PDB file of C-alpha atoms in Angstrom:
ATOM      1  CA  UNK A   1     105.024  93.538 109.912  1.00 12.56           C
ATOM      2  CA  UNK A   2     104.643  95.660 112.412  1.00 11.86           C
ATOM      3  CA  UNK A   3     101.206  95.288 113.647  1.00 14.60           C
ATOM      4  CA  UNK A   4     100.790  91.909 112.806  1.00 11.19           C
ATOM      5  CA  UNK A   5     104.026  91.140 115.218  1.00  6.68           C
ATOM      6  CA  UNK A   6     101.971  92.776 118.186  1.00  5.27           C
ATOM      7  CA  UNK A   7      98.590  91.083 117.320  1.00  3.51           C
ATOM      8  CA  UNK A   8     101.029  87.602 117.152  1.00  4.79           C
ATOM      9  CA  UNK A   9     102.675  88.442 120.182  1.00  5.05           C
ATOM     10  CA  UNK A  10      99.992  89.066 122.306  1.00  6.13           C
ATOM     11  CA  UNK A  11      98.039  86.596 121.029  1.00  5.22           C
ATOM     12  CA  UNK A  12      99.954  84.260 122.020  1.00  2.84           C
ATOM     13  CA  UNK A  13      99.935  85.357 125.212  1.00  2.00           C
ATOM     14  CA  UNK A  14      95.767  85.260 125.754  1.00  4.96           C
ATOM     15  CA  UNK A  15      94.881  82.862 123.709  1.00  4.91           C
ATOM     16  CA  UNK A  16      92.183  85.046 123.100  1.00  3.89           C
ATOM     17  CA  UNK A  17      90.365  83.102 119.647  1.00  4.46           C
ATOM     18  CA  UNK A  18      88.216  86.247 118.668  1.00  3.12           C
ATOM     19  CA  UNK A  19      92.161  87.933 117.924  1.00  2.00           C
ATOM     20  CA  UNK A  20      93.291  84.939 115.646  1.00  2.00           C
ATOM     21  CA  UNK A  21      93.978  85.040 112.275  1.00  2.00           C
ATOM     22  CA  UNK A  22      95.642  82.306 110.528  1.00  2.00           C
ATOM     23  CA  UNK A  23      98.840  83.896 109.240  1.00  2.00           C
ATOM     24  CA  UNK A  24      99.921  83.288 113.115  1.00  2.00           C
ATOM     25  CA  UNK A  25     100.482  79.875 111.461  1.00  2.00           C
ATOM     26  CA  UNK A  26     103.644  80.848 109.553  1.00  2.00           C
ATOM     27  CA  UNK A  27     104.850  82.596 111.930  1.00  2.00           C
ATOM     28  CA  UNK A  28     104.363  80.072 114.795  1.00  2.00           C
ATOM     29  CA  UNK A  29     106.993  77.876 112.724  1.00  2.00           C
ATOM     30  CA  UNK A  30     109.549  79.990 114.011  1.00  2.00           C
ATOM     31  CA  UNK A  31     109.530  78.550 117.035  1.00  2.00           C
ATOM     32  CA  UNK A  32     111.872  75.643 116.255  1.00  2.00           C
ATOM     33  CA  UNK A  33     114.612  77.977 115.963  1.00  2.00           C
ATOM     34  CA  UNK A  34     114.096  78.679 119.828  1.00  2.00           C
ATOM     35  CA  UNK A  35     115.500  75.756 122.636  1.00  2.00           C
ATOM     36  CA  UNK A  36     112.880  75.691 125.202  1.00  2.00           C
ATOM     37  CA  UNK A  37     115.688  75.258 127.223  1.00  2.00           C
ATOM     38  CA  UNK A  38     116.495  79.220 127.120  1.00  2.00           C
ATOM     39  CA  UNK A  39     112.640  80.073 127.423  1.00  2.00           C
ATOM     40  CA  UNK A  40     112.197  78.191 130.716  1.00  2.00           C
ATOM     41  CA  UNK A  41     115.315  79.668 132.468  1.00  2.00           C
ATOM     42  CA  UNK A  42     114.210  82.935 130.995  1.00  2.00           C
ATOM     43  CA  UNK A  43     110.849  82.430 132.597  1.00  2.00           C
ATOM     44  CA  UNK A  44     112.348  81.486 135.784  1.00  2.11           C
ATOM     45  CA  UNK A  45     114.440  85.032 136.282  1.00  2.00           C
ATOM     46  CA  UNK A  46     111.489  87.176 135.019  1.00  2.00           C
ATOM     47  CA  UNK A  47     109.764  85.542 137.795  1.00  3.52           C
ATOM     48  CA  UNK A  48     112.450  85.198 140.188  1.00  4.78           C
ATOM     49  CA  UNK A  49     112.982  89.264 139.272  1.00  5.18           C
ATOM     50  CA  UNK A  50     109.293  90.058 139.315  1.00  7.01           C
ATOM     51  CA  UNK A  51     110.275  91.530 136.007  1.00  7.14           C
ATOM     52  CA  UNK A  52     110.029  92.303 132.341  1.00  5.99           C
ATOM     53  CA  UNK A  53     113.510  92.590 133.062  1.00  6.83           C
ATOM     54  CA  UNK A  54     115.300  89.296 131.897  1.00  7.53           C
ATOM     55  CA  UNK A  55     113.184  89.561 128.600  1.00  6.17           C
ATOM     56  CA  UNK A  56     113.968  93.102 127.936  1.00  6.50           C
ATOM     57  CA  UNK A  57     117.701  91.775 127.936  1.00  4.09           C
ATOM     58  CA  UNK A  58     117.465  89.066 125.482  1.00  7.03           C
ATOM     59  CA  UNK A  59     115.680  91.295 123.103  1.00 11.13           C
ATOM     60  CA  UNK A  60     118.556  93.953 123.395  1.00  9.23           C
ATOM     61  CA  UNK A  61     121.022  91.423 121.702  1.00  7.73           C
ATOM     62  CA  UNK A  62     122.149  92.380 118.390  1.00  8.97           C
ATOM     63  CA  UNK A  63     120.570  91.233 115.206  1.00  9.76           C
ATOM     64  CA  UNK A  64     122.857  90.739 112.035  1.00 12.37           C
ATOM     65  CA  UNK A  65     120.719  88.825 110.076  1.00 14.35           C
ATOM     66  CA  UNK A  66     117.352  87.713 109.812  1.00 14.66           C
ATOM     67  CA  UNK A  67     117.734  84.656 111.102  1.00 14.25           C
ATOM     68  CA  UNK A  68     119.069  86.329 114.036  1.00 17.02           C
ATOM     69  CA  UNK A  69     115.786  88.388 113.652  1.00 17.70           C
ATOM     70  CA  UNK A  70     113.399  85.450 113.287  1.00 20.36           C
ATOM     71  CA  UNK A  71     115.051  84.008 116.462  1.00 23.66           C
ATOM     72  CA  UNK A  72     113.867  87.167 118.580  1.00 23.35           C
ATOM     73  CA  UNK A  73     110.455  86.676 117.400  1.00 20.29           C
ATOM     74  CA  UNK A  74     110.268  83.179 118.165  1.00 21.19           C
ATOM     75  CA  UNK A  75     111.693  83.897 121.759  1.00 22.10           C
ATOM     76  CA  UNK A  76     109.344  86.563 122.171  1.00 23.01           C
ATOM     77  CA  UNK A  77     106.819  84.612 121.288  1.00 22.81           C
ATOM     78  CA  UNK A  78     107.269  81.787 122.966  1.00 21.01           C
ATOM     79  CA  UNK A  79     108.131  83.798 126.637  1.00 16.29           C
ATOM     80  CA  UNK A  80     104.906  85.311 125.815  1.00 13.36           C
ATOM     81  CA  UNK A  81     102.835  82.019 125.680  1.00 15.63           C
ATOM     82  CA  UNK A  82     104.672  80.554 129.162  1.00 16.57           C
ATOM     83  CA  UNK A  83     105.218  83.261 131.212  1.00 21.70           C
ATOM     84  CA  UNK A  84     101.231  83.762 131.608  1.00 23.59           C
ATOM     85  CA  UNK A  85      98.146  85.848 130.476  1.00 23.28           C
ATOM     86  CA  UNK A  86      97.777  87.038 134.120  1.00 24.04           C
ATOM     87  CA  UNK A  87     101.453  88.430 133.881  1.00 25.10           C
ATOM     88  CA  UNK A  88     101.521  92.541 134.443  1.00 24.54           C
ATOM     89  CA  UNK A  89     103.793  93.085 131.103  1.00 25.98           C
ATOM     90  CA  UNK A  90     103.886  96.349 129.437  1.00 25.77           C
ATOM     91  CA  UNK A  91     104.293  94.965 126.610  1.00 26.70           C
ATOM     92  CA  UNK A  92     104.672  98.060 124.742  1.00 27.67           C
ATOM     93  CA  UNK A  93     108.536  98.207 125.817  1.00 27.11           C
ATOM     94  CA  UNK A  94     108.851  95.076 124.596  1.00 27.99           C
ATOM     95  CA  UNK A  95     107.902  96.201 121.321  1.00 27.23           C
ATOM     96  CA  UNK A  96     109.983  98.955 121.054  1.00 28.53           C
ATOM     97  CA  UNK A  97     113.463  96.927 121.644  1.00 29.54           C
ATOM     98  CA  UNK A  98     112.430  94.590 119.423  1.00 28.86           C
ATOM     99  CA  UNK A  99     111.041  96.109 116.409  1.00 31.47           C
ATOM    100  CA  UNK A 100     114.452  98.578 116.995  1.00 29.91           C
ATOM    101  CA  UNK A 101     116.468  95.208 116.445  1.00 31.30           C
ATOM    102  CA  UNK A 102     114.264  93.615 113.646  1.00 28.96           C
ATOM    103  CA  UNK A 103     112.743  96.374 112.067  1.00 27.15           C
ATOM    104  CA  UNK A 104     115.106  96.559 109.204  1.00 29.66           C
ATOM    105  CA  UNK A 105     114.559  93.045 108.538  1.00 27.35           C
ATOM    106  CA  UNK A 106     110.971  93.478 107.696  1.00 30.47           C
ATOM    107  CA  UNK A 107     110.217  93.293 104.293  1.00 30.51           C
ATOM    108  CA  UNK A 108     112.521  90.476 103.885  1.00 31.64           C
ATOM    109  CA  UNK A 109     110.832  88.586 106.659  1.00 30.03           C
ATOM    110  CA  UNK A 110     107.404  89.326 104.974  1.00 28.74           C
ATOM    111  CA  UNK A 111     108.736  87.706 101.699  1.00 27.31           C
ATOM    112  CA  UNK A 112     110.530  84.815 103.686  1.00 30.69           C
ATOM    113  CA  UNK A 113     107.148  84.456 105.425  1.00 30.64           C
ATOM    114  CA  UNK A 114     104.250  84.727 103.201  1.00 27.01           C
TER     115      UNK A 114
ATOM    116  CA  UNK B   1      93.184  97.113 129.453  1.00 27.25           C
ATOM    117  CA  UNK B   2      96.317  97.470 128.101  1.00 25.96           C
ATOM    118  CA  UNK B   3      95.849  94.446 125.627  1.00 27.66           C
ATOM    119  CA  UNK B   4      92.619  95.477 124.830  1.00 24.70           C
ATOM    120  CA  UNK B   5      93.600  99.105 124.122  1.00 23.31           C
ATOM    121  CA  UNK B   6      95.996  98.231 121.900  1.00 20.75           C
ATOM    122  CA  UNK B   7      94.134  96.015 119.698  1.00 20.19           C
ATOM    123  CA  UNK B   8      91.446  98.322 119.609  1.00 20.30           C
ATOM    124  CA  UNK B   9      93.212 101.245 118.218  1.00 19.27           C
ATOM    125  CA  UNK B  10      95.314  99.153 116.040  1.00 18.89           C
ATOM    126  CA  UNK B  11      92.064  97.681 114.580  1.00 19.81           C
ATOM    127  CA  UNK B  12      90.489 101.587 114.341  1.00 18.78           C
ATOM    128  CA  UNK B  13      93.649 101.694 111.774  1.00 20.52           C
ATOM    129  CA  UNK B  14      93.404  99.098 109.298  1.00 21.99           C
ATOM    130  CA  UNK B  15      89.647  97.881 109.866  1.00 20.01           C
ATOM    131  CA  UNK B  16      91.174  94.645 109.456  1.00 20.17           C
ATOM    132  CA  UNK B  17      88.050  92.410 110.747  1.00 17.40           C
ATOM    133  CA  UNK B  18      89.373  89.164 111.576  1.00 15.37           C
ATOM    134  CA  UNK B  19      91.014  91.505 114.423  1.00 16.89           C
ATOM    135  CA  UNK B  20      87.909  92.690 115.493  1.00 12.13           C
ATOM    136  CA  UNK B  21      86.105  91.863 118.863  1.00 16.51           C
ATOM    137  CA  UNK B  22      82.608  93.934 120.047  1.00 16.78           C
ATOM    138  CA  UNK B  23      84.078  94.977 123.259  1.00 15.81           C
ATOM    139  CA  UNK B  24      85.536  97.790 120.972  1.00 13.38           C
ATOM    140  CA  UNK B  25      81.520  99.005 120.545  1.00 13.31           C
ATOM    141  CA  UNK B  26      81.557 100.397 124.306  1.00 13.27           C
ATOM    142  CA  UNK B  27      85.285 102.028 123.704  1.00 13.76           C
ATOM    143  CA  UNK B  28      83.932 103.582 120.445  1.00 15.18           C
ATOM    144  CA  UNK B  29      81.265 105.397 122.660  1.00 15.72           C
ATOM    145  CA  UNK B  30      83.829 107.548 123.442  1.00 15.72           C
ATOM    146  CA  UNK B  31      84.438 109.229 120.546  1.00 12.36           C
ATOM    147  CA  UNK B  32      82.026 111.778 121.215  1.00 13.07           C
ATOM    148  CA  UNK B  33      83.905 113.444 123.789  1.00  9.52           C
ATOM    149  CA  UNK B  34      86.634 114.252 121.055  1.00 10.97           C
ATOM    150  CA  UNK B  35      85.934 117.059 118.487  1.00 12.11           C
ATOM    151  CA  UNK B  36      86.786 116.166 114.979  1.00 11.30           C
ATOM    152  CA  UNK B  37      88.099 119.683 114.831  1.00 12.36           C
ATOM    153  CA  UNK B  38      91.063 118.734 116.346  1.00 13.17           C
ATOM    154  CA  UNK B  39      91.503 115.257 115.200  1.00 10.61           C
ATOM    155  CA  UNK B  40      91.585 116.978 111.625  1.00 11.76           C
ATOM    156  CA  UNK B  41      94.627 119.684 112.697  1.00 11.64           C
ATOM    157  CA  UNK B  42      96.503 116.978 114.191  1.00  7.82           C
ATOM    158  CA  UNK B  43      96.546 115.056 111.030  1.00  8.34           C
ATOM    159  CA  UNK B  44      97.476 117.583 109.144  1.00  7.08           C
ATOM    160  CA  UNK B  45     100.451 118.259 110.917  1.00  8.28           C
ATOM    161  CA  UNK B  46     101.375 114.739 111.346  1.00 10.03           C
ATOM    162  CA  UNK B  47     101.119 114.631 107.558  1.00  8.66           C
ATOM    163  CA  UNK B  48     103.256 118.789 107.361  1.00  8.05           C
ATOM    164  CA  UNK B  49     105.939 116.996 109.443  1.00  8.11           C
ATOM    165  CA  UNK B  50     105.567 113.381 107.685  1.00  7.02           C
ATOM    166  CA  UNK B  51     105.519 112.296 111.765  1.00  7.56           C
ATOM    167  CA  UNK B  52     104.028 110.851 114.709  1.00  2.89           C
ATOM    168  CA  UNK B  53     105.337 114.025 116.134  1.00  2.00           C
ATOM    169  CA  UNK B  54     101.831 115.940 116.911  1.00  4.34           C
ATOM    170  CA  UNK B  55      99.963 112.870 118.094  1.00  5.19           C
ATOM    171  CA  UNK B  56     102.985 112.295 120.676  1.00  3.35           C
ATOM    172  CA  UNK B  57     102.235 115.745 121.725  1.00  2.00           C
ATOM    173  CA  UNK B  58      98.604 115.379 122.459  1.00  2.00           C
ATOM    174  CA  UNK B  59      99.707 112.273 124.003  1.00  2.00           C
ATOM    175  CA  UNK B  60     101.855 113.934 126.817  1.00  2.00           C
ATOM    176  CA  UNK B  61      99.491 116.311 128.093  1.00  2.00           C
ATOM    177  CA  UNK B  62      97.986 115.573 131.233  1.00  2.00           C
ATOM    178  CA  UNK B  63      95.656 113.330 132.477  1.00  2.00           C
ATOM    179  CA  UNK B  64      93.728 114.363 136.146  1.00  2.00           C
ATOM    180  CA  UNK B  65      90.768 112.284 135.718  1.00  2.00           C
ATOM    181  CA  UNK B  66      88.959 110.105 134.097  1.00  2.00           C
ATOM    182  CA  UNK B  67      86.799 111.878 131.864  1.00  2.00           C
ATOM    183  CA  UNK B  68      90.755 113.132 130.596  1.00  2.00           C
ATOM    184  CA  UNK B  69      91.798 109.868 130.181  1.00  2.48           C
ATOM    185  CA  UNK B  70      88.809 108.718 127.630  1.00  3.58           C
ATOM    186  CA  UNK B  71      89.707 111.792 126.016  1.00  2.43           C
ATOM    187  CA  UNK B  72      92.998 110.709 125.262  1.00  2.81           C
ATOM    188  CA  UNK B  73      92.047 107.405 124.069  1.00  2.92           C
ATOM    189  CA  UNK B  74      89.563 108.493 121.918  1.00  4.66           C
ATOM    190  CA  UNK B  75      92.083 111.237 120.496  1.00  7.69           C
ATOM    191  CA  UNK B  76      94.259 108.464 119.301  1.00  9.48           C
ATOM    192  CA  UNK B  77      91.621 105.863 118.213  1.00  8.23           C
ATOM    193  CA  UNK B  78      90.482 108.847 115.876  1.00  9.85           C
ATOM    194  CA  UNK B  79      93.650 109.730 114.399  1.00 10.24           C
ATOM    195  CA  UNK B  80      94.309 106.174 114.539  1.00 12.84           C
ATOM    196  CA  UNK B  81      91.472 105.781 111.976  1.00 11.35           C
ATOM    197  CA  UNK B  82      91.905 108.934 109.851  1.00 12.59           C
ATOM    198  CA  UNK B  83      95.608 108.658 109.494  1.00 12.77           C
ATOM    199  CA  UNK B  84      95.489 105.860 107.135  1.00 14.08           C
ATOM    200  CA  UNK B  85      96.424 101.945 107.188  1.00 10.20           C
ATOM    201  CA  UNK B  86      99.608 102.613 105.035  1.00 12.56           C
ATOM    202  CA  UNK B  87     101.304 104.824 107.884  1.00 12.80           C
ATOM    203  CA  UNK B  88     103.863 103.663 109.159  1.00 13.58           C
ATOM    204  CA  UNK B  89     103.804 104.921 112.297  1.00 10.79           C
ATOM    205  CA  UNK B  90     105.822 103.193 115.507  1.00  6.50           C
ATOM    206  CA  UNK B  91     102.757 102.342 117.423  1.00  5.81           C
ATOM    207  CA  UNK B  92     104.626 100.967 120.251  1.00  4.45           C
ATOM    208  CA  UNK B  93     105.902 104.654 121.247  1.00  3.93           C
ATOM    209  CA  UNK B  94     102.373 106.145 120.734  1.00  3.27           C
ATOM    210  CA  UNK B  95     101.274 103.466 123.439  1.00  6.32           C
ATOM    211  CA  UNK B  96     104.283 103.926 126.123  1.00  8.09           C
ATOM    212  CA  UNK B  97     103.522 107.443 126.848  1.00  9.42           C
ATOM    213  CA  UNK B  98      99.967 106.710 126.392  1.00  8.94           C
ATOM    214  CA  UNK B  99      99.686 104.052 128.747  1.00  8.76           C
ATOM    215  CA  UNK B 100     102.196 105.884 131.412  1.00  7.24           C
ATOM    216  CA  UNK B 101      99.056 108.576 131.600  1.00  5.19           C
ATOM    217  CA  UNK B 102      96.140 106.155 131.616  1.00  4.63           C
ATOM    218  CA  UNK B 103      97.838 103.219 133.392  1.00  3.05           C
ATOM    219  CA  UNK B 104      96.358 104.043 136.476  1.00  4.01           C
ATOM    220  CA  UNK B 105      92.666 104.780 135.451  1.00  3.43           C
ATOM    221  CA  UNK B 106      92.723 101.252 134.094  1.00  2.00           C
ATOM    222  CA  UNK B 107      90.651  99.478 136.724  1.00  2.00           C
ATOM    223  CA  UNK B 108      88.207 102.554 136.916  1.00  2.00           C
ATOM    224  CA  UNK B 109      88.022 102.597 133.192  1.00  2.00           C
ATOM    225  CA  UNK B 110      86.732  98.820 132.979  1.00  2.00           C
ATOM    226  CA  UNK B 111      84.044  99.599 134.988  1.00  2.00           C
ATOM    227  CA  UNK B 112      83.286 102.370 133.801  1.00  2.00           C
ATOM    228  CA  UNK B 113      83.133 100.534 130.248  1.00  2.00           C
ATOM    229  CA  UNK B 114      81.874  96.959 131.661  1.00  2.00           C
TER     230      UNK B 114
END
């Protein structure tokens, strides 16, 4: 799970088609559990902050279950595709917050997944 | 860079193809300036102490130029690739302290790369 959440992630942040793989398609379902409503004002503060910040806060939430866990991917993923492929993210913080919350969850998202 | 770093040494892990892009030929030039000596003593102890423990080491020496900072990226696309695909190893750690002492030879690395 682990590096195909970062290859996901930052995929669909670029765009980039040579870094696609198809299994992006399972996991890009998740994204109905996510109101764009959240993601836009979410996008607004990281920009209004200049900041990773706002982002780094919604992944430090707690996670009790995996839909709980699915959520944070889906949010994560879908801040990643609207805040920008220009935006300065290390996304490597990111990461760690978020596979500290979800990590657990792994193997059952795998089977819940694919 | 810092997209492109990480997908390159998480593709020098698992080979995984549909993850590969050639713009990881010109980073694999630098391979050479990293002796396989040490790249084998590192995974040993990473496998004595079952850890990413010695390639965080390596990662937090320092970094005064650029000919350091290839260094250090070639260290850890090396023991990326000999450590084995089945090691689960928190990448997203090995790239925070990695990035905080290339970060700012970014720029100079592209060009020197492209």
């Amino acid at each position: 799970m682990r590096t195909l959440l970062i290859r996901y992630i930052l995929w669909r942040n670029d765009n980039d088609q040579t870094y696609y793989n198809d299994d992006f398609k399972k996991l890009m379902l998740l994204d109905e559990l996510v109101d764009d409503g959240d993601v836009s004002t979410l996008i607004k503060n990281m920009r209004m902050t200049l900041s990773d910040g706002p982002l780094l806060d919604r992944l430090n939430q707690p996670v009790n279950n995996i839909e709980d866990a699915k959520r944070m991917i889906a949010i994560s993923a879908k801040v990643a595709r609207d805040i920008g492929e220009r935006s300065e993210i290390r996304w490597e913080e990111s990461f760690t917050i978020l596979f500290r919350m979800i990590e657990t969850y792994f193997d059952d998202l795998m089977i819940d997944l694919y």
